[PDB]
Design a binder for this molecule. Structure first.
Ligand code: ADP
Ligand code: ADP
Ligand code: ADP
Ligand code: ADP
Ligand code: MG
Ligand code: MG
Ligand code: MG
Lengths: 535, 154, 154, 523, 59, 60
């Protein structure tokens, strides 16, 4: 080159705008075949041969290697949808890539993009205001029916699709079992406080819900008992090993006769602590730290159960559920050490079971509060991992519905209505912005097209029928009931989705529109690029 | 006082941060020099128009140099009229015409697409921005003209 | 200009020039480069006409002084108790960035930050180290807020 | 210099992928389908370290094979889930999976969406389970001669079938002994308490199951006794040796009498240990760690016998057999932790090497199976066969049900499903029938290995089952004639069949939900 | 990068290698540390003396 | 922000603030001002001067 010696490659004009659109478009095409109940799955084989099967949109993109900056923006777009909501991570990627592609043709025609950007923002703001007319009140619907159907709808297009009724009952029961009562009047449903365990073996229809808690640990020693019919659980956070002076303290001996008493105290301080614990009636001991082999003997003779190397987060939930209190030391508000009986947990049973060649621990019927855990069974490990990711999507959907009592129809009824509304509303602007708004309405129409294409049907006839039905709902307000016509993919016909039981939380459609528009605007504001060579 | 900035990407957040940091600096300048001036390229067209009339007063070799300095100020008002998709020659000719027969607030109006009174559009900027920009520019150019040779050292 | 790695020795003084305006004013960091660019461009014609460079440097300084007096006669005083003027100044320096849409929310916030840091009676300078900007992911730009207190990350 | 988007990642899609996975699944089945039936031949495998695995086990064949293809990795994995779950049926599960996956491509090429097939497959699985439970046979575990026929019907297909009458007794006695009810009502049949020991030489007719345990150790000091009749035994955990502390200790000595006194204090401390053990008057001392030379001197004085450095896996078996429990600190040694349930202690020589025996227990809950034979390779195949038998017997004791073997169940299920599909209207009718017809690959494989006509024998057997009460008719695997299973006497536990059908159906569902492959993305 | 007019700063940064040129650089550095001015005049004068000296040798 | 001392007792030392547009001007200004301070300090030590502008060279 001549001027601007930068030691790098720069591109300007139509060169970088077209290149950015293709980079964004290619990301959508990878995951376009994973949307809808007729969707399929993918493998992702790394170099070392580890296999992974999933259709979860966020998981796929996180596992790919991308270096084009216009595409990396979309990869974290799906990641953000996971944290904020947890569902619809594939719908957002498709929408964002369609907004860019449709806006690019507007810019090739001599339209200044700042006019286009303002057109997009107005469309997004008006769409969210309109979406508060298609609201369905949760309490108006049956409490159990709305939760069950919402879980079933978000469980379709997965490995456990037709097993919905079995799994939807498990999912709702687990969520209602962790309901928390909080400040003034706010309830709380902290999902991911339910422990999910995987173990291959029998079929998935024999996966069982546990009314209590489950630990992936085994008892410390063989001689110790392996079932307690009335547990007095004590939770501890410190190791039980032979004591040892701190690093600052040294031991110097000038009278040999004192050596014998010195060495006893190392093993005798720990003995006294154990007897304080066992004198109050504790049967089960749980510890995050380790336990020396000598300390296990005292539990054996007293007939008590003890476990070492317990995860912190597990101990927090058991202490909350069983009423016990986590201790990092024994000292009290005075000098000496005490261990009262008002600080013990209580559970109805502790059993170590056998599940396909290994063992784990079950705690049943905790009395302070209720807690639940789920064990999943499958043909092998790859299949077991798939239900786990496919169950986390079900837990999040139910939690969002309970917190916010409002759902919207699925199948594409939302996009079909919005496309009709925006096209009619843009005719009252009377400036170059109507062009941008009209492009927004057409871009939303990609979702119903993608669903019908994957089912090997006529995506032109079906979508044309919807636009006729939703039009007759906007005008002629006697037929206003026709704003719930959705889409059926098995028979390729329209059907009333509200009565059919297809529901999605509103916070999915609402948040997806906002996030997609922001990612489309930031990419649209780039006209040139500068890349510096590696040093 | 503290401000919390949100966003959807790390790229958007940093650009949102820098934009806020300028809005803060504009207010700071408004306290150091309690003066306001019209924007939209008005300070530059008016600068060029009066310098042209000033050059005719001078005689000799100096008159040419001030004329070159006068015409250099036309770059900015043309640049704004170019990025908006207008005809740069037509706009600047209209601007210099309207500044030489009266009003001085006339400037480019992107919303309307032509030239109109600027203060009716509520676009202003502090005086220190225009003065400091000009002063630092001329000091650098006078420094560049003193250079004569380039050599390579260790 | 900082992020790019310019290699020409005379192109490495423009990056420092733009940093000079940033320190004193915080705005007009692009415009000052454009002005400095056009002054040097107009110099190539004069050197061909036979002008010695020393004459050019002296003549520009003559023009710079005249430029100062035209701008000063064009300005207008501003009183800090006038809130409307400050908003129009802040939103004008803010509608040139990506957050021009969200300026209807940020512009009243920016002025509030400055008015809660200084005393308008004896304000001769503003220190921006008492205003802290905290960056947090998630949400959109429309969720920013001003906190009249302390925010801790840990 | 170059512009890229994904940086060296391959990708495939379309109908090539669906046909690619199925063709890979069938190839694995073709490797193993020669190892089914009483006429099955063996295979020998070669390992990276130079050993030879001459085996007939279905799982054993596959775990020594390296395959790149993603589709094949699934088939290898479900092989070991079956073995870890029910221990038997690692070959019939693979053959079913290939056939259930192969009769599906017929529908795919007729433009049928996979989700239509999947809903049909899992719908046929429920009727498969219900029909199996209908024809189940209840068994009485108190009948020994009935339990011998169950185990015999599961090892007639292996190498020990020559010594079958011996093998059933070994497998049955061990499982009948390790059964243990404990605190609460938790009944278990754990299998880390049934050690299998191999010693080359002798003859295979010298194998026996001991009432106790065997140890590959010998007495520390030769003067110590080697033959005791009724030993009183104690099991320790710590070491009888003056070891250092851990609290950053050091000794400063400034007198003539401090160096010697310190040394004498270590011998008094050991004498404190030995005297405390003697207080309980035992005859045998077993410890996990070393024993100082001084400690042996005091112990041999009191006519004790000691063993050094026994693995923790062996103390737990001894503790359960004799009746003692392990005690770490001798100061807390009592009379309730001393084991008096032995009946002999003997140390023999088996080919220039010393063994320790503890047999004739009063009521042991741990056993040690002793095996003799030609060489390591043959005995390696013996224990693999014995493990299957002991896993077969356990499943009967937890779910006392039986179903006919030899292919009788598959035809019984096939008939029931087919008669039910003609009440079904819709496109799912066709996949619902092809899945049922895929079960007949079990009798067909048995016929071909026997050397008979697979066209004539199978059509006669299908016609047979069409009648009202003939559900127990199967195929004899040695002559090739349809015989009733009541008289021949072949049965297998209900748990084995249920897992075989469940695993086979679910794997076919997994690989039918595939559409594309992405590779080489380097984590 | 630096822009300078001083005659001693320039001669310090230049990487001369001719043995006779290193003598001229050394006087300029010393002169700067002595009175702080005239670094350019000393080197020009010390060079103009040698320019006339070569003509005299040719005679 | 810098600490300001005003109305000092002796004042036998001082500070000088330099301003400019580029780092090249600031360095050049500081280096140029070093020449002036030194040559003036020599004049105070020995206060006898000789004319310049070529008047001195032509005389010798
Ligand atoms: N029974 C159904 N009929 C029609 N559409 C459905 C049905 N079940 C789910 N969907 C549609 O599937 C879409 C997204 O489902 P999914 O494949 O999980 O993608 P995402 O990752 O966006 O959740 C939703 O827009 C919903 O309308
Ligand atoms: N609404 C407007 N109409 C016309 N000109 C504007 C408007 N807003 C800002 N400008 C112009 O933008 C110019 C500089 O804006 P900016 O892009 O921030 O460059 P700089 O970095 O030099 O400040 C100013 O000269 C100002 O006149
Ligand atoms: N004597 C026999 N005659 C006919 N079939 C038999 C006989 N013994 C065993 N079988 C059949 O062999 C099948 C599988 O046994 P096996 O060869 O051990 O393979 P796997 O147990 O790995 O499936 C069983 O279904 C059983 O019905
Ligand atoms: N205004 C002036 N008129 C005439 N001669 C001058 C003037 N200013 C400086 N000089 C001359 O310039 C000469 C060179 O000085 P200078 O440029 O600083 O280089 P040096 O490093 O040798 O001092 C001096 O001999 C001085 O006499
Ligand atoms: Mg989804
Ligand atoms: Mg600006
Ligand atoms: Mg078998």
């Amino acid at each position: 080159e001549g001027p601007l010696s930068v030691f790098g490659d720069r591109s300007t004009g139509e060169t970088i705008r077209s290149q950015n659109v293709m980079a964004a478009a290619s990301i959508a095409n990878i995951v376009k075949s994973s949307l809808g109940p007729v969707g399929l799955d993918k493998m992702l084989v790394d170099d070392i041969g580890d296999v992974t099967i999933t259709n979860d949109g966020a998981t796929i993109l996180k596992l790919l290697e991308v270096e084009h900056p216009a595409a990396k923006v979309l990869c974290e777009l799906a990641d953000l949808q996971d944290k904020e909501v947890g569902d619809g991570t594939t719908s957002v990627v498709i929408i964002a890539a369609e907004l860019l592609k449709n806006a690019d043709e507007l810019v090739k025609q001599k339209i200044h993009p700042t006019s286009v950007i303002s057109g997009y923002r107005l469309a997004c703001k008006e769409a969210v205001r309109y979406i508060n007319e298609n609201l369905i009140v949760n309490t108006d619907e049956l409490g159990r029916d709305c939760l069950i159907n919402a879980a079933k709808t978000s469980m379709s297009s997965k490995i456990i699709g037709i097993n919905g009724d079995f799994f939807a009952n498990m999912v709702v029961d687990a969520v209602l079992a962790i309901k928390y009562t909080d400040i003034r009047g706010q309830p709380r449903y902290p999902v991911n406080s339910v422990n999910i365990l995987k173990a291959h073996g029998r079929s998935q229809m024999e996966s069982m819900l546990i009314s209590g808690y489950a630990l992936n640990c085994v008892v410390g020693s063989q001689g110790m008992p392996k079932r307690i019919v009335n547990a007095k659980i004590a939770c501890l956070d410190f190791s039980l090993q032979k004591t040892k002076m701190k690093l600052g303290v040294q031991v110097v001996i000038t009278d040999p006769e004192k050596l014998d008493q010195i060495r006893q105290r190392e093993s005798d301080i720990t003995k006294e602590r154990i007897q304080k614990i066992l004198a109050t009636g504790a049967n089960v001991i749980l510890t995050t730290g380790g336990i020396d082999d000598m300390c296990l003997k005292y539990f054996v003779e007293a007939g008590a159960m003890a476990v070492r190397r317990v995860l912190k987060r597990d101990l927090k939930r058991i202490a909350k559920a069983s009423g016990a209190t986590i201790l990092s030391t024994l000292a009290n508000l005075e000098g000496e050490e005490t261990f009262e009986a008002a600080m013990l947990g209580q559970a109805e049973e502790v059993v170590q079971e056998r599940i396909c060649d290994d063992e784990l621990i079950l705690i049943k019927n905790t009395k302070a509060r209720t807690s639940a855990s789920i064990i999943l069974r499958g043909a092998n490990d790859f299949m077991c991992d798939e239900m786990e990711r496919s169950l986390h999507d079900a837990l999040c959907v139910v939690k969002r519905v309970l917190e916010s009592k409002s759902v919207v129809p699925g199948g594409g009824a939302v996009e079909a209505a919005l496309s009709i509304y925006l096209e009619n509303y843009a005719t009252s602007m009377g400036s170059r912005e109507q062009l941008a708004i009209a492009e927004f309405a057409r871009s939303l129409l990609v979702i119903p097209n993608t669903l019908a294409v994957n089912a090997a049907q006529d995506s032109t006839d079906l979508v044309a029928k919807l636009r006729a039905f939703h039009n007759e709902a906007q005008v002629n307000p006697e037929r206003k009931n026709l704003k719930w016509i959705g889409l059926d993919l098995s028979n390729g016909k329209p059907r009333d989705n509200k009565q059919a039981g297809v529901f999605e939380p509103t916070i999915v459609k609402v948040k997806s529109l906002k996030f997609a528009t922001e990612a489309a605007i930031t990419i649209l504001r780039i006209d040139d690029l500068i890349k510096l060579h590696p040093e | 006082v503290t401000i919390v900035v949100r966003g959807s990407n790390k790229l958007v957040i940093e650009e949102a941060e820098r934009s806020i940091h300028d809005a803060l600096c504009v207010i700071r300048c408004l306290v150091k020099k309690r003066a306001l001036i019209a924007g939209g390229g008005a300070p530059e067209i008016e600068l060029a128009l009066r310098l042209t009339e000033y050059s005719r007063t001078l005689s000799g070799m100096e008159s040419y140099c001030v004329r070159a300095f006068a015409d250099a100020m036309e770059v900015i008002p043309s640049t704004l009229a170019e990025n908006a998709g207008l005809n740069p020659i037509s706009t600047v000719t209209e601007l210099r015409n309207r500044h030489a027969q009266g009003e001085k607030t006339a400037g480019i109006n992107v919303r309307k697409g032509g030239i109109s009174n600027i203060l009716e559009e509520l676009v202003v900027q502090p005086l220190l921005v225009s003065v400091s920009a000009l002063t630092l520019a001329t000091e650098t150019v006078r420094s560049i003209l003193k250079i004569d040779d380039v050599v390579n050292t260790r | 200009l900082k992020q790019m790695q310019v290699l020409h020795p005379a192109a490495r003084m423009l990056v420092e020039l733009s940093k000079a305006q940033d320190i004193e004013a915080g705005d007009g960091t692009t415009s000052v480069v454009i002005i400095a660019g056009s002054l040097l461009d107009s110099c190539t014609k004069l050197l061909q006409k036979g002008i010695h460079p020393t004459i050019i440097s002296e003549s520009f300084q003559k023009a710079l002084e005249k430029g100062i007096e035209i701008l000063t006669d064009m300005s207008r005083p501003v009183e800090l108790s006038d809130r409307e003027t400050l908003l129009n100044s802040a939103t004008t320096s803010l509608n040139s960035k990506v957050v021009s849409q969200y300026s209807s929310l940020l512009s009243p916030m920016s002025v509030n930050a400055v008015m809660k840091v200084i005393d308008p009676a004896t304000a001769t300078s503003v220190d921006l180290r008492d205003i802290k900007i905290v960056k947090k992911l998630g949400g959109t730009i429309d969720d920013c807020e001003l906190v009249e207190g302390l925010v801790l990350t840990q | 210099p170059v512009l890229v988007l994904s940086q060296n990642t391959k990708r495939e899609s379309g109908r090539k992928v669906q046909s690619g996975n199925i063709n890979a699944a069938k190839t694995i089945a073709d490797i193993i389908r020669t190892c089914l039936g009483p006429k099955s031949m063996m295979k020998m495998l070669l390992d990276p370290m130079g050993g030879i695995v001459m085996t007939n086990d279905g799982n054993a064949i596959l775990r020594e094979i390296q395959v790149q293809h993603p589709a094949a990795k699934s088939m290898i994995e479900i092989s070991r889930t079956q073995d870890e779950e029910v221990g038997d049926g690692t070959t019939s599960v693979i053959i079913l999976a290939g056939e259930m996956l192969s009769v599906a491509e017929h529908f795919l090429e007729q433009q049928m969406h996979p989700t239509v097939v999947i809903s049909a497959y899992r719908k046929a699985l429920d009727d498969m389970i219900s029909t199996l439970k209908k024809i189940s046979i209840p068994v009485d575990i108190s009948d020994s001669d009935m339990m011998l026929n169950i185990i015999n019907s599961s090892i007639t297909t292996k190498a020990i079938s020559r010594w079958s009458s011996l093998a059933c007794n070994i497998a049955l006695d061990a499982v009948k002994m390790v059964q243990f009810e404990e605190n609460g009502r938790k009944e278990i049949d754990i299998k880390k308490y049934a050690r299998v020991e191999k010693i080359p030489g002798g003859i295979i007719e010298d194998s026996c199951v001991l009432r106790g345990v065997m140890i590959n150790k010998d007495v520390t000091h030769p003067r110590m006794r080697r033959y005791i009749k009724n030993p009183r035994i104690v099991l320790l955990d710590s070491s009888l040796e003056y070891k250092k502390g851990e609290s950053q200790t050091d000794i400063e000595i400034t007198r003539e009498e401090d160096f010697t006194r310190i040394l004498q204090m270590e011998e008094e401390y050991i004498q404190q240990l030995c005297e405390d053990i003697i207080q309980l008057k035992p005859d045998v001392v077993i410890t996990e760690k070393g024993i100082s030379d001084l400690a042996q001197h005091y112990l041999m004085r009191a006519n004790i016998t000691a063993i050094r450095r026994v693995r923790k896996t062996d103390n737990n078996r001894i503790a359960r057999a004799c009746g003692a429990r392990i005690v770490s600190r001798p100061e807390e040694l009592r009379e309730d932790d001393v084991g008096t349930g032995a009946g002999l202690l003997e140390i023999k020589k088996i080919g220039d090497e010393y063994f320790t025996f503890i047999t004739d227990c009063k009521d042991p809950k741990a056993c040690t199976i002793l095996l003799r034979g030609a060489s390591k390779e043959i005995l390696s195949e013996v224990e693999r066969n014995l493990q299957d038998a002991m896993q077969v017997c356990r499943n009967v004791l937890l779910d006392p049900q039986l179903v006919p073997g030899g292919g009788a169940s598959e035809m019984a299920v096939a008939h029931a499903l087919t008669e039910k599909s003609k009440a079904m209207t819709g496109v799912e009718q066709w996949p619902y029938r092809a899945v049922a017809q895929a079960l007949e690959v079990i009798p067909r494989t048995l016929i071909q290995n026997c050397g008979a006509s697979t066209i004539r024998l199978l059509t006669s057997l299908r016609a047979k089952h069409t009648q009202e009460n003939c559900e127990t008719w199967g195929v004899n695997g040695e002559t090739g004639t349809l015989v009733d299973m009541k008289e021949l006497g072949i049965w297998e536990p209900l748990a084995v069949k249920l897992q075989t059908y469940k695993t086979a159906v679910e794997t076919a569902v997994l690989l039918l939900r595939i559409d594309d492959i992405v590779s080489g993305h380097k984590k | 990068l630096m822009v300078t007019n001083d005659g001693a700063t320039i001669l310090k940064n230049i990487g001369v290698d001719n043995p006779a040129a290193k003598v001229l650089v050394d006087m300029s550095r010393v002169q700067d540390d002595e009175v702080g001015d005239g670094t350019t005049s000393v080197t020009v004068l010390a060079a103009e003396l040698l320019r006339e000296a070569e003509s005299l040798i040719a005679k | 922000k810098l600490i300001h001392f005003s109305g000092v007792a002796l004042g036998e030392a001082c500070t000088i603030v330099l301003r400019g547009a580029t780092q090249q001007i600031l360095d050049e200004a500081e280096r140029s001002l070093h020449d002036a301070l030194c040559v003036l300090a020599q004049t105070v030590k020995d206060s006898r001067t000789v004319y310049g502008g070529g008047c001195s060279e032509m005389l010798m």
